[PDB]
Amino acid sequence: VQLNQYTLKDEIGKGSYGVVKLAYNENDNTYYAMKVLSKKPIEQVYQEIAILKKLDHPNVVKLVEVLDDPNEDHLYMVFELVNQGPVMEVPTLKPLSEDQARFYFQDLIKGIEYLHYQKIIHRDIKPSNLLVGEDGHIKIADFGVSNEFKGSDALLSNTVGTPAFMAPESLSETRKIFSGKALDVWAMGVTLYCFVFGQCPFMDERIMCLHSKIKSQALEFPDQPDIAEDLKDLITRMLDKNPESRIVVPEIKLHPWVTR
Ligand SMILES: O=C1c2ccccc2S(=O)(=O)c2cc(-c3nnn[nH]3)ccc21
Ligand SMILES: [Cl-]
């Protein structure tokens, strides 16, 4: 499979939309990641590309070029490869150590904080969108459902992303308005829980009960592995079900587990 100067190889990931394939560029003799999309509405992909074109940061993926012929049904986004892949698979029986989780969480904070400064709400923070680069650091991937905003926060009404990671205030069925920065914080908390426990804090195979637990089940910590109380404190604050009192990113940065 050859698309201009690129040679498509095997699938390496499957995102919110198309697939990602390893691609080899014959010009410069280099591997890239290629998101492959087929027109199935189509507006949102060019919102994604616009957001991508604006982002230049070491903890965010780098869009290299877009291949769009008006005649072929497929559309290609070329990203710089992030070779080690997702930071972890969820669920797992081998979660990260606290020191590992701290290391990666620190990257996650700097990226989210950059995104929020650039006025992007990511809306799909989770371990499989956190890719480990050549140097061992995290890069945030997949802006397929992200939101851009004007002013100091986003004022959202739609429900998107991955169910297990959706903040409770995005799950009223009366179409209410909710702010966007707190949605990313919630997902960071579910993510940090996954790092150290290897599974999600709210699991159910019936979607109705997964929503019910997210909205109404008190956060429970497993006996094993026994984690530090300050890490418990931080997760508890990020998974505060009330977005008004949920911890903000400038406070997360100062948290004693984080600076430890
Ligand atoms: O290098 C990537 C990679 C490398 C190894 C394994 C798995 C992936 S990957 O498919 O998870 C991915 C996804 C994106 C992406 N960014 N925005 N939408 N998709 C960009 C790069 C990569
Ligand atoms: Cl995941």
The identity of residue 242, as a single letter, is N
Q: From which experimental method does this structure derive?
A: X-ray
Report helix, strand or coil for 12: strand
DSSP type of residue 27: T
Q: Looking at ligand 1, which residue's alpha carbon is closest to its atom 18?
A: 142
DSSP type of residue 205: S
Pairwise CA distance, residues 118 & 105, whole Å:
20
Pairwise CA distance, residues 114 & 129, whole Å:
16
Q: What is the resolution of this structure in A?
A: 2.6
CA of 20 to the centre of ligand 1 (A): 6
CA of 128 to the centre of ligand 2 (A): 4
The answer to whether residue 124 is catalytic is yes
180 annotated ligand-binding residue? no
Helical axes 181-197 vs 229-238, angle rounded to 10° = 140
| The Cα angle at residue 257 between residues 194 and 252, in degrees rounded to 5 | 80
Burial pattern 24-44, b for ≥16 Cβ within 10 A else e, equals bbeeeeeebbbbbbeeeeeee
For residues 225, 107, 112, 251, the Cα torsion angle rounded to the nearest 10 degrees is: 70
DSSP string across 225-247: S---HHHHHHHHHHT-S-TTTSP
Radius of gyration of the CA atoms of the chain, in A:
19
Cis peptide before 225 (omega within 30 of 0): yes
| Choice among 68, 73, 124, 240 that is catalytic | 124
146 annotated ligand-binding residue? no
> Cβ neighbours of residue 7 under 8 Å, at least 6 residues apart?
1, 23, 24, 25, 26
Given a contact cutoff of 8 angstroms between Cβ atoms, the answer to whether 240 and 169 are in contact is no
Pairwise CA distance, residues 215 & 179, whole Å:
16
Pairwise CA distance, residues 60 & 75, whole Å:
22
**In 18-97, which residue ranges form alpha helices assigned H by DSSP?**
43-53
The identity of residue 20, as a single letter, is V
Residue 89 CA neighbour count, 13 Å, CB half: 5
12 annotated ligand-binding residue? yes
Tell which residue, 45, 3, 46, has the closest CA to residue 22.
3
The pocket of ion ligand 2, defined by CB under 5 A, consists of 90, 126-128
- Domains annotated for the chain, with CATH where assigned, are 1-81 (3.30.200.20), 82-260 (1.10.510.10)
> Cβ neighbours of residue 205 under 8 Å, at least 6 residues apart?
none
Given a contact cutoff of 8 angstroms between Cβ atoms, the answer to whether 138 and 108 are in contact is yes
Given a contact cutoff of 8 angstroms between Cβ atoms, the answer to whether 119 and 227 are in contact is no
Backbone angles phi, psi at 112, to 5 degrees: -60, -40
CA of 78 to the centre of ligand 1 (A): 10
Burial class (CB in 10 A: 0-12, 13-18, 19+), 85: middle
